[PDB]
From TrEMBL, chain B:
Role, per record: Processive actin-based motor that can move in large steps approximating the 36-nm pseudo-repeat of the actin filament. Can hydrolyze ATP in the presence of actin, which is essential for its function as a motor protein. Involved in melanosome transport. Also mediates the transport of vesicles to the plasma membrane. May also be required for some polarization process involved in dendrite formation.
Signal peptide: none
Family: Belongs to the TRAFAC class myosin-kinesin ATPase superfamily. Myosin family.
Quaternary structure and partners: May be a homodimer, which associates with multiple calmodulin or myosin light chains. Interacts with RIPL2, the interaction is required for its role in dendrite formation. Interacts with MLPH. Interacts with SYTL4. Interacts with MYRIP. Interacts with RAB10; mediates the transport to the plasma membrane of SLC2A4/GLUT4 storage vesicles. Interacts with FMR1; this interaction occurs in association with polyribosome.
Residues of the full protein shown: 819 to 866 of 1828
UniProt-recorded name of the protein: Unconventional myosin-Va
Superkingdom field: Eukaryota
Length: 147, 48, 144, 147
């Protein structure tokens, strides 16, 4: 379970992107932004777990070897988008794939990882959901499938 | 929580890829004018 | 047009120092960037491999004109570059910092050399921390 | 390639001209003047190539057999004034077809072969070239027509 040199190069490219200091160190918030940018799939609790695994030494910054290590772990995770579709269907009270944007926002924010209204509006724009009219999420989870 | 994390990472990755492609095109365009200047200098020398 | 093909042949002959009638892959890329088109490094290598699939390392004129058609399809208007910069620009008014541009350009895609960074900074006359327009820089690169 | 009798007669007339001593072995520096006044259009690089051929022949002096052979290789060159007009136009900064004589002198002398100032003035002279004003391209057309 080791990253391919192509993915290693891409992740080093993102590493240099977030090397605002340029010394090879990544902040925990910077690491989370990197996680979002790479498409790897942690939980916020899992994000904190990875952060403390890195900070077992106490540096507070993420180096490239351990970076490749948890990236290997993350591709070992390999979440499925069909599970996301089933989660949406459970979320969809109608169950037909069409769910109101207000219900989506409420369930999206008031459970576990709270989200700002700005992120919810951004997701609505990305998912072309209508606040009043029901809009199918199947297109948005099809885009999720790309990852 | 799973949908929150998945949505935010996919959106950030998508915007990052768009930005990367745009900046790569920009870098190519920037090398373009310098190479144009070198080619123009070569033409100018030959005409001289 | 026919004048464009004639100028391409003129550049082809002048760049060819040995006069063999077929350019080298390094010369190929040099004249690709010199002719006005903007080759992205991934697609630059893509066209390089498409040409060198025969393995000769030499570029014949008919396929050269065909991938000139490919290049002119590849060419992007100034408006796209301005829109991309505005997306990168926090202000969104066309005034962007040169330091942010330098870091983004160097990190994203190909590594941009510091001398080239200084070259484009001086051309665009954009301050590293100050907000200066990128647009006229784009048009004057297009004109050259 | 053997030319007509009148061709060789004119060639030997110029040969006797530039032969200040009449020896028949003319150095390279004067041979270049012979070549340019004879009717050829030789590149300075091509002139130096001819000089290398002469040096391989030896003594750096021209003989009429070698002279005739390099005639045979040189008459094949022909230039059209449209190309030179385009060269002057791309030399012109404004691109309107008119370049100042001082600007033309600077552009021609700074790069390429370092032509001397006296022969630049000789360009300005005998062609009605206005020093401060922009040079008429028809003057250059006539100058190349007279070669």
């Amino acid at each position: 379970d080791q990253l391919t040199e192509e993915q290693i190069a891409e992740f080093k490219e993102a590493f240099s992107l977030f090397d605002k200091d340029g010394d090879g160190t990544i902040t925990t918030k910077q690491l989370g932004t990197v996680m979002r940018s790479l498409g790897q799939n942690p939980t916020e609790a899992e994000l904190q777990d990875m952060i403390n695994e890195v900070d077992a030494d106490g540096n507070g910054t993420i180096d490239f070897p351990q970076f490749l290590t948890m990236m290997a772990r993350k591709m070992k995770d390999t979440d499925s988008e069909e599970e996301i579709r089933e989660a949406f269907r459970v979320f969809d009270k109608d169950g037909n794939g069409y769910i109101s944007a207000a219900q989506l926002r409420h369930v999206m924010t008031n459970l576990g990882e709270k989200l700002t209204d700005e992120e919810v509006d951004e997701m609505i724009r990305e998912a072309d959901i209508d606040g009043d009219g029901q809009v199918n999420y199947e297109q948005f989870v099809q885009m999720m499938t790309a990852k | 929580t799973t949908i929150q994390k998945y949505w935010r990472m996919y959106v950030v990755r998508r915007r990052y890829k768009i930005r990367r492609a745009a900046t790569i095109v920009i870098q190519s365009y920037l090398r373009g004018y310098l190479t144009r200047n070198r080619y123009r200098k070569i033409l100018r020398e030959y005409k001289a």
